[PDB]
């Protein structure tokens, strides 16, 4: 199954991607929980 | 040719509207299907929506094993009201 | 030692002789620890890396969207608070669930081979699936009813080797198939062909060749075959006459060619068995080349491809034998090298060398097509395309489920080095299966065992719930993958991206529609414990009942300390349903472990290690009852050991481990049997099951002869309330107990008050009574862990499942013929075995298409005698005695088109009753059941109209909450008056007034919480209960019935002696002694020699001494004896016979007199299972209470007055009342309702059907001459419309001959055969 | 048929019949439109599998499966598949005038009668009461007579007592293995809810009092009432249908009172006195001036049936005990006195009932087997026999055999470490050694258990038979055998293994002294092996007796 390591290598690629964005020009949005769009 | 009890073509056309409108409302945002909140989206009275949803026959089968063990049937446990003791 | 508050009231005489190093741990640790790992409530920002709820989100969420530039990233999840509490959830029908809000962000990309220009949008998503959030006792409140989820004992993933020799091979030596069992799906197999070959297979495929699987993976056929059996190279200087002498292969092989090597001497004659002396000559000789013949190399095939340097091409392919025509080519080509295979019959046969020529699959290109022939022959995939296709099909991680424990068991069995193997198969593991499967044929090693505890894994609720949550997540991603790819992030929100329906539906069916989640039987605190320690081998994805056989339903030498061998249910599943041991504990991988004591040759160490099943065969394990020299040394030359799963006897210099306690082998229910070593294993198995079916009596009575584990079952079951913190009890009420927390055990800076609400008479899952009674007083101090109020069937913290009766063993006029019990009238007048049963009766109001159903107070065709018990709403009052046939609630249904018979309307005009168009469908009690209405619950829709009684019950609930809040503030108000006054009188005016603002700030902040709590309960009372669609109102009542003991009820003991009471004789008829004390129960002594259970009599002998000592204490206490004489007699009982106790620690005037008052009825004694009292210690207490050491006295007959001519064994035995009463066993029927198609009797009208007349009873009548009795029971008693109605008229008329007619089972058979186009008629 | 809440429920044949009509009418309309052969050949093909799926399912035509797990239930599936209407009725059928309840021993009942509760008799015999109330004049209509039974009027009990006087009822246990599983009894009204069963018919029914239930049945027609009295009565089937031996014999509780009564003692109270008749023996015993078993001489008047048609009486003076003379009072006239001069074991009583059946007949035997049950229950209560902790006597020479056999194995284990014997040679040496010591303890235990009772006759130490409770229950054949007393007093021996081998270390302890933790775990191997074997004994033997009936039924 996809239990543990089936998609582990993909997480490191996405984690490193957000690190470059959060360094310069990185913003975080506090979206409300109950939002339709 | 779908249901057991045949519905006329004049009441079966408007029945698909209540079933199509109920599908979009249940998936709005973590919503549960119910006949109370659908009466406002279609501007239908409370007594009218209970008759349209209840018009669906959805007949069951008596030759089905009730429970995990396949040793008893539903037809073998039914009784009659016309014949007496 | 120091005694707590509960232990000072009554002390049990312990006959234990072995010291205890470790006490019994928490019994329900397997249900609580497995759920905390899955549901991590208390955690920091950094979660754990377990396989629970966090691993599911960490494996399904982080996936990019195909044909798009979006991806979902999982950040974390948080657990909220439940809407309702624990106790207020079983009455409303809620699931006591808790929501979880997982924070998942959505990322966007540009699909430019680089993750740039992203926009993270973190949004706390709504609850996906509400977790049931099991309680602190290990139960899941699902839809109001608490359930347990038993653990599953499934097979561990890995490889398994065995013999499997049967009728298929028609011989003794046979080769088994190594069937690799993954975690889920993608099964494999490897079967060895009988003709020195190997034929692998699949879960559904036929026999596949093993030669094509070697060259398709990338390995060469020449190198893989040379490294399988052996490899030998020979040099040839123009003539191929040489043999590489192997010191290992030449040993044990005869040489048919005479050799003259040795510079003038002979080594081996013509066809002679070489000896070890001549074999060792070749080592010190140093020779390697020898003159070999040409006719002896024709059998030895070649290993690798031989290439000649003169010709330039492969002169001989791999796996080719030598022939006569192939010998002249070597002399002409003059090859410098030669490689042949040296195989023999004494060693392992080269099965891989012979199977390499099968189907002509040796090359790399020809082997890749043979595999595709078995997977998909003639498919759309090409020859080379299917090779790359199949290479990635079974290599998929999601397809080939291989857990971490399965990878460990895979490498450990084959002998690999890397224990934590990867989830995918490796090329280094495929070579170990070949060398291990062919080795099991010649018998050069050992095989595996599929029934050992090392191959079986325990799966708890934490893994079964995480697997269902994982399936629910993969069902969400498959539906939200197409929605995210065809859309963007700026047009929607992360909430609308995925759906939460499949997750909530996956966990809804696991707790409500799974065979593992079953209703907990709470008719006994012991049944609740054994239901949670239960390990079932059945269930989904496991071994079922039909495929069990006999090899799994037995015990194994590895079950010592992990699974109880005398706790299997007798019936269709015996040996499949097991129970965990007392000291057993699961390992990290899921294997069962048991504690042991490391013992050395000089000192038994104090450290305790928990050993698994596979780690047990290395060490030497001795018994726990081994003799010691008061210094840690064994004093026996011959000790009992089980080092290699063999119960043998060895020396004390070879022991390495020691057991902790003799009770670690038996389970909890099996350890509560005193003198277990004297009972047979068949009776002990039945005694532990009947002890589980005991009904809580009206008065709880402790057993005079116990074990000591009774104070651990009642504490770990949770039926009794224990003190969370220590302090002084403030006030004791019959419904609640409030304690004042001590000054030292307070976490915050206030006083602190704990309030415990006691559970009053409530209904159990088995329709029994459950209530708690206070045990503390006003003004006594308690510590953390003391029992404040005992639960059902508990006596002062102990376990009281039954009562101890005066038993005499003798035949009494045949009333105790085989197993019947001759009872007295004293046990009925004293209300000994009387029990309370609570029954629930519900009445629902639906919405008929003609008209709705409403609860009213007007019933047609009734009188005043039936409406006086109801009220203005239509429901009976609480506390009204209802007989059989009374009306509970009023309910009428509108009817239309009745079509009344004209002969009926003439009769209604006789009296003058008006015609009402309403059918009477009121809720009434069944026939034969009477009780008292103790509680009425009313449920209605949210916003629906409520009757007058709905608000009346609401007003009572709103006041009991208000009375509790006023009591909470009243006790804390007095603490503010004594603390402020003590500091004002004792020892600056500004500092005195400054502390008043802080004291009043706490009483004002608590007052604000009381208003929030009061408005919370008021809001919950107004919330309408959600029910099934189509129901308007639900009214349920509760009836309480007190069932006494009557002839027919089933009684039993703790030693497997069950019976049914036959008669209740008066007191004057029971046998009495010289003093005139009559017995209570007369048992038959003929059962003891048949079923060997001597502990049944040893309990009777020890029970006589326990009651005899209580009579001396009572006589000593009534004569106003001094305290110095009481503690002297108590020291003679506890500190003189055996075991070990301690006195002179309690006050004589207050705590010793209170102890002697609890021993007035009898002195309780503790007898462990294998560390109990002997025959000498039992007779030592018989002579202490002025009783005969033989345990037998001469009795007198109550009816004739004559004395019996033989001494009779008397004493007190603990009896139990089982849940097999005759009130639900006696049935009778004359007529009734019949079915629709087949006119056969059936139930459904508050009455059962009939007795099924099977074929075995037909053969009994056919064996007789009863032809009219057989025809009557087949035609006129069933399946006859004109037969039953005309026979009933005959019985009333007076005469009765027969009415045969024709059965309806045959009339329907004719109409069904005719509908198949087959004509069938009666020729007559 | 509809259900609760307006929901309907149909069968699996309505949608099958509807599917054929939907395709048959579609084919009839496709023929008048002059449709080509390309489109009409596919519609005629659909009509094939439409009717084929209606007749039977599982063939090459896959059955329809819509919104359901099970495939379907066609016409042929109603008469086949282990659930057909023809096979479901052959294995069972509910009947009227029946009921069930637990069983209970009644020691005061006769052989031809049983106990029936009042609450069950009112329901089983309900139609017979309605016809008796109208014939007597207590009720005018059947509607008024039914209301009298619901109120339980006192005059209804007088009517119920008359409708069951000569009306037999049938009792049967759930496992009906042989013919004696169904027997007819005359029901009597008892207070309670449990069916009072006769103690002697418990052997044929194979029924114990552990909560077992027994079904009842009421024969309606007088043709079935005569078959229950002349064929299915309990007094008619007194012999087994498989052998010639009586099946209704005194059980363990009755044979225990008849063995203690006829058990000669050496010296007792009232030994050597003479009695003029059997009535003086009872008169001397009831006064307490004579022991139950003392050597006396009583003059007896007996009759001999050995002569053809001549019942000649003979008066002789015999030398017997007091208990054997009291037992001869219930013996019929056709039997001599030499039949009660023995110790009256279980094998001796069954041979007396068989000999009594061939001499005096059946009427004098059904009243003689009831007298043995009354005499056995009476004299087993006077003697308060009981099992205690001192009844399992241990031979003093058991320690001299266990300690000697343990030293004979220590000298062999030294030879195993020296290379003299092999693994297989040592296995057969220690297995045959403990088997010899187990038989040596058993023969030394029975010698000390049977001849331990000593007495004094005018000054002496004479050894007689042991009057021990554990010895009497095994000697009389009531309960227990040599293999069970061996495990209580003597050593248990060597235990088996589910694999089929014998463990080297035996169980040298008994159940009186107690077992160790390892000795108790070894005994659990053969315990669950025998318990799990019973599940196959009821599944394999039941399949054998069913195949034997299907062949020899005609
Ligand atoms: Mg039984």
Author numbering:
A (entry chain G): 54 to 90
B (entry chain F): 166 to 250
C (entry chain C): 1 to 987, 1020 to 1356
D (entry chain D): 253 to 806
Task: Provide the authors' own sentences about this structure as they appear in the paper.
Focused 3D classification reveals one major population of SutA-bound RNAP-σS single particles, from which a cryo-EM map was reconstructed at a resolution of 3.1 Å, and one minor population of SutA-bound RNAP-σS single particles, from which a cryo-EM map was reconstructed at a resolution of 3.9 Å. In the structure of SutA-RNAP-σS (open lobe), the RNAP-β protrusion is embraced by a patch of crescent-shaped map that could be assigned to SutA-RBD, consistent with our YTH results and cross-linking data in a previous study. The 3.1 Å cryo-EM map exhibits clear feature of an α-helix in the middle of the crescent-shaped map that fits well to the 20-residue predicted helical region (residues 57–76). One end of the crescent (residues 77-90) travels across the surface of the RNAP-β protrusion and approaches σ3.1, four residues (81–84) of which likely form a 4-strand β sheet with RNAP-β protrusion. The other end of the crescent (residues 54-57; wedge loop) fits into the narrow gap between RNAP-β protrusion and β lobe and leads the rest part of SutA-NTD to the main cleft, where it likely adopts an assemble of multiple conformations and thereby does not show distinct map signals. SutA-RBD occupies a hydrophobic groove on RNAP-β protrusion. Several hydrophobic residues of SutA (L67, M71, F74, L75, V81, and I84) likely participate in the interaction. In the SutA-RNAP-σS (open lobe) structure, the RNAP-β lobe domain swings ~10° away from RNAP-β’ clamp resulting in ~5 Å increase in distance between RNAP-β’ clamp and RNAP-β lobe compared with that of RNAP-σS holoenzyme. The gate loop (RNAP-β residues 373-383; corresponding to RNAP-β residues 368-378 in E. coli), which serves as a rate-limiting gate for promoter loading in E. coli and M. tuberculosis RNAP, is opened along with the movement of β lobe. The main cleft of SutA-RNAP-σS (open lobe) can accommodate the downstream dsDNA as shown by structural modelling.
